């Protein structure tokens, strides 16, 4: 089996993108954050706090005749600075595109954190990380790939991210006429859940590429470029004006300034990020100064490939025995 399903951006900055996921039956349709850097299908539900909900779409599993509560399962993910979201757990039916995975666990939320209530576009996430990963306690549960997999006819999904506009996760598929040139495969380590590789080095504009290892993460769900401070103050040295600013938390720049691209390296092929997909814009309604979209790894303990740098590639996440990452120029 396959599926394919349009992902959009829920803003003008392309802060996340959105991808429709149905739940239950009859389906209920959720616009999902597909997230390779974590691994819960977690919903706004008719068990959230009702002054938590603003906006978004509600999965009602009483209203589902395939949900089945999961006994005695909660989940709870806590953020690094802002409170948690949790629930309880159903299993139920799940499809992205026609592809359906029956007995899929669906993480319900009781409480949400403020910055999810705050972002009406957004009704949940599905994770796409490794198992491992996964919060449901006393029984963890499977993601939505891992469930699938084994019916795929390729154990693969691919990332298509569009800059402003929309794009497309394919399951079980490899589509040769989303990318050019070819797909270069790089090795990934496992251990700590995530899509985690190693960069081979960076070029800023047309300037000259530096070979140096950059571990980090291939993840959907973060919207930035987060990178050694090095390699983020070679790049902002090149925009007459920006600097990092403590308060604001991050470079910024005039809004005047033309960003220059900055590449990445997979193997010995190359990802150019134009210097646009690096703008978001003002820091506050009418300022003239603008948040950078490549910023310091620093406080993170790890790099994140965020959206910045995956909606410049086409982008493979192979789940074979041994997983790899491809990277293709689109």
């Given at each position: 089996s396959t599926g394919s399903a349009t992902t959009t951006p829920i803003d003008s900055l392309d802060d996340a993108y959105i991808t429709p996921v149905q739940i239950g039956t009859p389906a209920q349709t959720l616009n999902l954050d597909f997230d390779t850097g974590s691994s819960d299908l977690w919903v706004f539900s008719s068990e959230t706090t009702a002054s938590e909900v603003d906006g978004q779409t509600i999965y009602t599993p009483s209203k589902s005749t395939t949900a089945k509560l999961l006994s005695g399962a909660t989940w709870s993910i806590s953020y690094g600075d802002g409170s948690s979201s949790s629930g309880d757990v159903y299993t139920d039916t799940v499809s992205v595109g026609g592809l359906t995975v029956?007995?899929?666990?669906?993480?319900?939320?009781?409480?949400?954190?403020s910055s999810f209530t705050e972002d009406s576009?957004?009704?949940?996430?599905?994770?796409?990380?490794?198992?491992?990963?996964?919060?449901?306690?006393?029984?963890?549960?499977?993601?939505?790939?891992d469930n699938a997999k084994a019916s795929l006819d390729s154990p693969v999904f691919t990332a298509d991210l569009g800059?402003?506009?929309?794009?497309?996760?394919?399951?079980?598929?490899?589509?040769?006429?989303?990318?050019t040139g070819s797909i270069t495969y790089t090795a990934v380590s496992?251990?700590?859940?995530?899509?985690?590789?190693?960069?081979?080095?960076?070029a800023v504009g047309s300037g000259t590429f530096k070979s140096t290892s950059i571990d980090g993460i291939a993840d959907t769900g973060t919207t930035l470029l987060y990178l050694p401070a090095t390699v983020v103050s070679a790049y902002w040295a090149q925009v007459s004006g920006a600097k990092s600013s403590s308060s604001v938390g991050g470079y910024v720049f005039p809004c005047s300034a033309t960003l220059p691209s900055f590449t990445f390296g997979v193997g010995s092929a190359r990802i150019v990020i134009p210097g646009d997909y690096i703008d978001f814009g003002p820091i506050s309604?009418?300022?003239?100064?603008?948040?950078?979209?490549?910023?310091?790894?620093?406080?993170?303990?790890?790099?994140?490939?965020?959206?910045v740098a995956l909606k410049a590639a086409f982008v493979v996440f192979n789940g074979a025995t041994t997983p790899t990452l491809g990277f293709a120029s689109k």
């Open positions: 029956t007995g899929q666990a669906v993480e319900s939320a009781k409480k949400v954190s576009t957004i009704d949940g996430l599905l994770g796409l990380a490794f198992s491992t990963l996964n919060t449901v306690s006393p029984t963890q549960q499977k993601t939505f790939f800059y402003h506009a929309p794009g497309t996760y394919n399951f079980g598929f490899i589509d040769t006429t989303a990318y496992t251990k700590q859940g995530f899509w985690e590789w190693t960069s081979t080095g960076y309604t009418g300022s003239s100064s603008c948040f950078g979209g490549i910023q310091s790894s620093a406080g993170i303990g790890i790099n994140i490939f965020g959206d």
